[PDB]
Amino acid sequence: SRKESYAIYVYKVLKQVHPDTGISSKAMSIMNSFVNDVFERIAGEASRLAHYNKRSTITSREIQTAVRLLLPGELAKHAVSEGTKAVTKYTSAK
Amino acid sequence: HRYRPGTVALREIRRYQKSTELLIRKLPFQRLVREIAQDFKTDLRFQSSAVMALQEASEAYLVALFEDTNLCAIHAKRVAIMPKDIQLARRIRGERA
């Protein structure tokens, strides 16, 4: 039985970008491997940051520095934007 | 008719850099995998997907080592990669340090 995967949310995103393009299974498998990988690297660094600073909590602040530390210049620029935006919109909504 | 040496090679290069199929035959490979593992633990069964991953990894590894090797041969103003060229590459990669 039971095996989660980012496969559907990947597919949803694939449609806001290439509404008429589709993806093969082996490919989806790679995108899933891609998300889990980034997830871990970002989480891990967040983890370390907190520990270095003697903190029990991983916040978006930690997630942010982690992205800074993890991603290449321009890619990290957008990543921060996207991220700050999602937290803003979220907070400003019951 | 006859093609000059190197002509068919570049043809072979252009062709293989276009494709993604594996270049080692599955059976001989699987045999080599099981053999090597038999020294780590007797009576082992391999998921077909596990052997597949090992092969996908192995080839991707060699294909890259051959790139760096080609770069070492070229560095020495040659066009044919040699054992020393692999040797120098693995050494700079830390696979020997």
Partner: protein, 79 residues
């Protein structure tokens, strides 16, 4: 032999994908020896994961986890 089962044509096919035009004669034997060390390193690790899980079957994840700590992360077969 098994390591001899990984043949010249195939080793030459690989070199090609890597941009190699001319191949010396002693490469093939060198290539294998390297392929051997590669697999012995990765499998050993993968097989350690198999035992920890108390299984008799090396799984694709067992390999993926070994490859990752070898620094050879592979996408497509799990995790």
């Amino acid at each position: 032999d098994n390591i001899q089962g990984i043949t010249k044509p195939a080793i030459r096919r690989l070199a090609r994908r890597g941009g190699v035009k001319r191949i010396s004669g002693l490469i093939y034997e060198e290539t294998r020896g390297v392929l051997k060390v590669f697999l012995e390193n990765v499998i050993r690790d993968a097989v350690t994961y198999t035992e920890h899980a108390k299984r008799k079957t090396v799984t694709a994840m067992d390999v993926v986890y070994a490859l990752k700590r070898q620094g050879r992360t592979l996408y497509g077969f799990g995790g």
